Design a protein around this ligand. Structure first.
Ligand code: VHG
Ligand code: VHG
Lengths: 482, 482
């Protein structure tokens, strides 16, 4: 259900967080289009005052002369009196928006950065697990920027998600694992993330400063301030940081193959600044988890479906050692129950069901196969909510929860299905998971939570997942029987 | 192993490189043991002289401070007068050694080092080949190292291999797709390569130079300068250079998962040098493609094994429809002869076999199992040399070149086998491999082979090797034939 958590158009508000410089260019005489109320404490003149006029009469040697390589390169180094700010510019509406903001100072970066990166890619990164991949990312970002707590909050199925890391200064709180809403990083904000990796809400205690003059003439709405290394970000997300204990919340975003995954998310007690170049090399490490993820949750399969096949290669040479349908589906479906580690399986190869492991009684099954000739799939329907499809076989939530359809033939109920059950689970939310975002009488003006204190919920009457190798252990066993 | 190339004790050989100054202080109260030849140049005295004399009673004030921060840190920033170098050390045989050796002249070395990490990484890399993947990185090695000819090359099957990547400058003789030996980086090299990537012969033409006193007081032979940086080399490797465009080598490990997937040398037309940090930068990137093409085989497998589920599926729902095997197979033949990377096929199910496609004569299909049942296997026998281990069929470079077996019922002579042609496939060999290195009258000191021109090896035999997602389509079939 779309809501104004999603609705509300967070690219175009009134640009930028108060340490910036947007001076923007309709046409070939540059000309100053959308300026910045905060433009008098760099430059020397007020903005209004050169809003109508060229970059001949605006920019100083420093930034101006390297307006050439701006185009050429993407980044340049204006080192004008105030110290050393950045620049960064792309095309907008009819706009060559020069951005521009503070610079890094230390040679650290390469040396710091590197010693850091070779942590997150050693001789063999994954000797004791994937947690140890996840975490180092966390460790290194919090130790590469210089922070307190960070995390690995990944989305799942619902676009829900949970934090899967922690590195800290013994004396904050956290959010260690705890599942907490899908009504946070919503579709308009977290789809602008496939596009615009990195954020910097930082001294997100302070106020947002406007542009000039609100509507960027021609267009109608504000600018398009989405691709801009500065976005002042919404209230709805900042009223909420203020209840959380955040001057700055960084968030370094993620992806492997043209899908999201989760974020990085660095909380800090007071507010901090990270440079174009080094929240760009933040990006180079969040990028570097998304590989070694891809790599060997992939390769895990290969390895881990040899040790599956051997269990097929066993129940195959059974086949080889004397015609014995029933009796050799009996013994080597200890090894079938364990193909997909489960508690049973009933088979309908014509007669009744020689049904073996730890499942329901014939009566129930027979009522199940009929009902299952009613459902629409090419080979194998599976479910992990046995009530949510066929609630006759609810109360069997203790040995049933999912089944593994394989139609052994066309216009027939010839089959085999098995019985995977319910499991504890304490996915723990950051307050009652029902109410995530709660407002005042009318329902147009809504605010944050103000909570996060481990209100538990019990994912229950559920089951496990169905790893690529389950689905695939079946289509090989189709051919076995035929 | 094999011939005066054989034995040579290539590490413990004394003799170092002339821009660095190796020397260790054995003993507890840390006392200068053996000093290195052209040891002064930086050290101000005659080498021999100060052969007793504690840590720093000898080597300056400057380094005496630094003495402390390298015990702890591995690496320090020494700076005497003569531009002045920095030692990276270890503890390579009871004594614990200097490697006092140049520096980074300009803080770009790192600047560059990081951004060429980006070229070889951005998610959307390897999206126009893996020839290109490999190459893309290889292009950003050479970008740093300065060098004038980079390789990146793989050892196939044997411990031979072929230059399968280039990237030279102008008028540079090139091995683009060219090919050469095994007796180059021989047994001795690697065992030494797996533990420390990197080797540098930089004035590869300037002559080594002793280090007093060729054999260690309390041990026997020359040092054992195994792990080091201004070592030298078997007096032969830099020897099979003086008869090439020899600049100075620079080679790396790509130890892929466990084993040595090859390496990547680069030489100039004359002298160069690179630094401790720029070496490590070298190192870091060969870890890279290595990790990269691990993640690519380990992937494109997963693609194949899923790709021929959806084949098999097709197959089994021919298999479970009509009258009998011979009938269903007639068409589905072509579909199974698309599985063992499909070439041809047998099918000895008792009766006179079957030929479904391209095959030889029913006699030769029986005279195979006559041989096969007499010799070993639990199942199956991909030999692509099928005309040598079994030459009754030693002329079938049309119809059969290897085969694929499968025990259909085990302890019983029913198989189901695959014919798989010879394949003409040009090979441009470098000089004559019937000349690894021509020796002198005696056969006891070898100089090398001093020519390397295009050498044709159009082979007729072998057969496009069966892989995992090849071979792998068989375990299932064992199960199918029943
Ligand atoms: C009615 C809409 C609502 C918004 C708007 C909104 N939500 C987000 C996303 C967001 N939420 C969190 C929470 C959080 N605390 C942590 O420690 C971590 C990670 C471990 C998370 C995810 C985060 C971090 C984010 C976005 C990442 C970030 O905040 O840096 C956003 C994104 C902000 C934007 O404008 O881009 C918006 C706009 N918030 C609500 O509660 C509801 C009302
Ligand atoms: C009779 C014994 C022989 C030796 C002894 C020997 N050779 C080497 C070095 C070596 N050869 C190659 C191959 C190679 N890599 C490339 O990129 C190219 C083309 C430009 C070629 C031909 C390599 C890579 C190496 C070592 C890499 C390097 O140069 O650093 C060594 C290694 C000595 C050491 O480990 O320090 C030994 C001991 N070589 C012969 O050909 C025969 C005569």
């Amino acid at each position: 259900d779309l809501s104004q958590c999603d609705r509300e158009p967070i690219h175009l508000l009134g640009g930028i967080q108060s340490h910036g410089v947007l001076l923007a260019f309709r046409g070939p005489d540059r000309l100053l289009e959308v300026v910045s109320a905060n433009a008098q404490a760099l430059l020397g003149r007020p903005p209004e005052t050169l809003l109508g006029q060229p970059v001949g009469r605006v920019l100083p040697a420093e930034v101006l002369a390297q307006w050439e390589p701006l185009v050429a390169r993407g980044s340049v180094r204006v080192v004008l009196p105030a110290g050393a700010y950045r620049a960064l510019l792309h095309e907008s509406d009819g706009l060559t928006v020069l951005e521009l903001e503070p610079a890094e100072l230390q040679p650290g970066m390469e040396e710091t950065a590197l010693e850091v990166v070779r942590r997150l890619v050693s001789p063999l990164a994954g000797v004791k697990g994937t947690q140890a991949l996840l975490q180092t990312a966390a460790d290194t970002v919090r130790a590469l920027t210089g922070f307190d707590r960070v995390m690995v909050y990944r989305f799942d199925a619902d676009w829900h998600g949970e934090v899967l890391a922690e590195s800290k200064r013994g004396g904050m709180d956290g959010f260690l694992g705890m599942h907490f809403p899908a009504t946070d990083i919503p579709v308009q904000a977290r789809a602008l993330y496939t596009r615009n990796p990195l954020r910097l809400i930082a001294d997100a205690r302070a106020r947002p400063v406007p542009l000039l003059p609100p509507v960027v003439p021609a267009l109608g709405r504000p600018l398009d301030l989405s691709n801009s290394a500065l976005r002042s970000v919404s209230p709805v997300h900042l009223e909420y940081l203020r209840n959380m204990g955040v001057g700055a919340s960084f968030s370094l975003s993620l992806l492997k193959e043209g899908v999201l995954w989760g974020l990085i998310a660095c909380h800090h007690l007071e507010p901090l600044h990270i440079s174009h170049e080094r929240r760009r090399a933040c990006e180079v490490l969040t990028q570097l988890l998304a590989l070694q993820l891809s790599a060997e949750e992939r390769a895990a399969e290969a390895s881990e479906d040899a040790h599956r096949a051997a269990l097929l290669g066993q129940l195959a040479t059974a086949m080889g050692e004397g015609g014995t349908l029933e009796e050799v589906l009996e013994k080597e479906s200890e090894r079938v129950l364990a193909l997909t580690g489960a508690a049973g399986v009933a088979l309908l190869l014509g007669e009744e069901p020689l049904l073996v492991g730890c499942t329901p009684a014939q009566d129930e099954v027979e009522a199940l196969v009929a009902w299952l000739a009613t459902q629409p799939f090419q080979t194998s329907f599976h479910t992990d909510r046995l009530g949510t499809v066929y609630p006759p076989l609810a109360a069997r939530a203790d040995v049933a929860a999912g089944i593994l359809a394989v139609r052994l033939a066309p216009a027939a109920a010839r089959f085999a299905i098995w019985f995977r059950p319910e499991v504890a689970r304490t996915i723990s939310w950051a307050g009652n998971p029902r109410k995530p975002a709660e407002p005042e009488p009318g329902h147009q003006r809504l605010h944050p939570r103000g909570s996060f204190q481990a209100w538990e919920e019990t994912v229950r009457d559920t089951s496990l997942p169905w790893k690529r190798a389950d689905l695939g252990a079946a289509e090989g066993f189709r051919g076995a029987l035929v």
